Each structure stands twice: as structure tokens, then as C-alpha cells.
Design a protein around this ligand. Structure first.
Ligand SMILES: CC(C)C[C@H](NP(=O)(O)CNC(=O)OCc1ccccc1)C(=O)N[C@@H](CCCN)C(=O)O
Ligand SMILES: [Ca+2]
Ligand SMILES: [Ca+2]
Ligand SMILES: [Ca+2]
Ligand SMILES: [Ca+2]
Ligand SMILES: [Zn+2]
Length: 316
């Protein structure tokens, strides 16, 4: 909407106060004009018709329980935009400052979040398995990263290419969580998963097997559930990424860690310069090796560590 840029205040899903960029024109809207061509947050009003209505508020204060998922979807989309711009010189998901749109309060009891080809969508959860999913910064960044992937490598959402697609979203979701630097970890979704159980998460990158996901190519799933295991076999790539950053010895193979920033540079370059819609795990290894060679040199520790990490997870 046309209006003037304003700054509101509210509380997110976990009860934390934050400022949000809004737009005033009769109402205050969740429209942040400070980033690209805008970040826009919508109310889906418990229905499944998208996007719903651009979020409107009478007083620019967002402290109602119903407001909390919108506050966080809006704010964490801004953090994710900032990560891609400041760290990777990427302007929004398409590289040309496309408007970023999210809808919250999607459906009833909906235990998921997704990119629908055009926008982000967040359920409220059923209150037992999940609380409103935009409360997780790793979740929000996971979803926006699907848009980045779709505009760049275009990884098809099935089998090995789809597991790479998933891992890319978990990797950058985690790197955005570290960028914001609030309780960062190598777990996925911990802030919104199972409010009645402490210390768990939906997936682990540091130890995928903790939640039943493979940590070695020999343990990959090859059935048809979950689009051929896209959220299962992602563990193999998530583990490799964790090892590249943090190091470790895994199935007897030692990896010297090179840190999160270099992990992010290598995988961002692989995603945007080398991967294709049908890349498999072996092709990802080659893309990561080439990316690290471009950035750091063929004889570098960074290249050697990429090779060790993929060796450790059984990907040649
Ligand atoms: C980070 C977590 C909290 C959310 C994440 N959701 P996602 O991977 O972005 C779901 N996207 C998806 O399916 O895209 C395909 C598509 C949909 C619509 C239109 C076009 C294409 C996820 O890991 N979901 C799991 C766990 C879900 C537990 N109930 C899961 O779906 O099995
Ligand atoms: Ca209000
Ligand atoms: Ca965390
Ligand atoms: Ca996390
Ligand atoms: Ca929990
Ligand atoms: Zn995903």
C-alpha cells in the first residue's frame, strides 16, 4: 500500500519484544519499506486461501496473542533479507529485490510451514507438536531459502536433488540463526517444536541420527515417502556441512573445521554457480570442491576439508 514508513512495537511467539517496520495509511500495516521492494505480512485468518489480507492494526502496537506469529514472520523475514544482502550481496530471493510476502494463521492446527512458489506460509501448530512456526528464526530462514534455491539452482523437490534442496534450507536457516546470535545451534526448529518437551528439535545437523535421519550415504532412504526422503536424506548433507564448519571425526574420518562463514561462502557459491535442478549428492560434492577452489585455492585447507567431510558421510 502507499503510505509512510513507521516503526511499531510488539511481542513475538516466545514473548520477546521487538520493533517492526510498518506502513501508515489509515491503519498501520505489516509492510516494511526499508528492505528492497518491501516485506509484507498477511493474515490468513485460519483459512487456506492465500495470501489473505495484508495485516492491518489500528495503533501500531502488536502485543495481542493473535499478533505474535505475524510479528515474528515479519521481523525474521527482515533478518533473513539482511543476512543475504550483507553476507552474500544478494538482494532478496530473486537477486532483484522481489517483494517478500508471508501469511500467518494458515489453516487450523497446521504443523508446518512452506514456500508455495510465490510466498511463505506458516501454520499455528496444534499446540502440542508445534507452536506458531514463525517463532523459529531457523524456520523462517529455511522457508525463504527455498525461494532462493528455486530462483537459482532450481533443485527438483524429490530424491537426491530434493534432499540437497532441504539441506540448503537447513544450512542457511542455521547460518541466519547464528547471524542473529540468539541461542544459536545446529538443531532445526527447536524454538517452536514440542513446547512440553525440552531439549529436542525436528532435525539435528550435528547428529542427524538423534532423530532417525541418516548421517552416512550407506544409510540413505530410497522409498517413496516424503518425496523420496527429502527431509530424511538431508541429514547426510547437513552432517557434511556441520563437519566442514565445526570439524570432527565421523566413522573414523577426521575433518578439520573451517568455520561457519567459510561454510556459507562455499555453499552459497555452489548453489548459485554450480548446482542444477537435477544435481545429485556426488555432483554437490564436486560443486562444493570447485566453489572452495575458486574462493580459497586448490591447495587450501578449505578444499581439503570439503573433501574430508564428504568422505566422512560416504559421498564420492
Ligand atoms: C523447518 C520446518 C519447521 C518446516 C519445513 N517445511 P518445508 O520443508 O519448507 C515444506 N515444504 C514443502 O513441502 O515444499 C513443497 C511445496 C509445497 C507447496 C507448494 C510447492 C512446493 C519442514 O521441515 N517440514 C517437514 C516437517 C513437517 C512436520 N509436520 C515436512 O514437510 O515433512
Ligand atoms: Ca494493535
Ligand atoms: Ca536456537
Ligand atoms: Ca536452530
Ligand atoms: Ca520441544
Ligand atoms: Zn524445507
Amino acid at each position: 500500500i502507499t503510505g509512510t514508513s513507521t516503526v511499531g512495537v510488539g511481542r513475538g511467539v516466545l514473548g520477546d519484544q521487538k520493533n517492526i517496520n510498518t506502513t501508515y495509511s489509515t491503519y498501520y500495516y505489516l509492510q516494511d519499506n526499508t528492505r528492497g521492494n518491501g516485506i509484507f505480512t498477511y493474515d490468513a485468518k485460519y483459512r487456506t486461501t492465500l495470501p489473505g489480507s495484508l495485516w492491518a492494526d489500528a495503533d501500531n502496537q502488536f502485543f495481542a496473542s493473535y499478533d505474535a506469529p505475524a510479528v515474528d514472520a515479519h521481523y525474521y523475514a527482515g533478518v533473513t533479507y539482511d543476512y543475504y544482502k550483507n553476507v552474500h550481496n544478494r538482494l532478496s530471493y530473486d537477486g532483484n529485490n522481489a517483494a517478500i510476502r508471508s501469511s500467518v494463521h494458515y489453516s487450523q492446527g497446521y504443523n508446518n510451514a512452506f514456500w508455495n512458489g510465490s510466498q511463505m506460509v506458516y501454520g499455528d501448530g496444534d499446540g502440542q507438536t508445534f507452536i506458531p512456526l514463525s517463532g523459529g528464526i531457523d524456520v523462517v530462514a529455511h522457508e525463504l531459502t527455498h525461494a532462493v534455491t528455486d530462483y537459482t539452482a532450481g533443485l527438483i523437490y524429490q530424491n537426491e536433488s530434493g534432499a540437497i534442496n532441504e539441506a540448503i534450507s537447513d544450512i542457511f536457516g542455521t547460518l541466519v540463526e547464528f547471524y542473529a546470535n540468539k541461542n544459536p545451534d545446529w538443531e532445526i526448529g527447536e524454538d517452536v517444536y514440542t513446547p512440553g518437551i525440552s531439549g529436542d528439535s525436528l532435525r539435528s545437523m550435528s547428529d542427524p541420527a538423534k532423530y532417525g535421519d541418516p548421517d552416512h550415504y550407506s544409510k540413505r532412504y530410497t522409498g517413496t515417502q516424503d518425496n523420496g526422503g527429502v527431509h530424511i536424506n538431508s541429514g547426510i548433507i547437513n552432517k557434511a556441512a556441520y563437519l566442514i564448519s565445526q570439524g570432527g571425526t565421523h566413522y573414523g574420518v577426521s575433518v578439520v573445521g573451517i568455520g561457519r562463514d567459510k561454510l556459507g561462502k562455499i555453499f552459497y557459491r555452489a548453489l548459485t554457480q554450480y548446482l542444477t535442478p537435477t544435481s545429485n549428492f556426488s555432483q554437490l560434492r564436486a560443486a562444493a570442491v570447485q566453489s572452495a577452489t575458486d574462493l580459497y585455492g586448490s591447495t587450501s585447507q578449505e578444499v581439503a576439508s570439503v573433501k574430508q567431510a564428504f568422505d566422512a558421510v560416504g559421498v564420492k
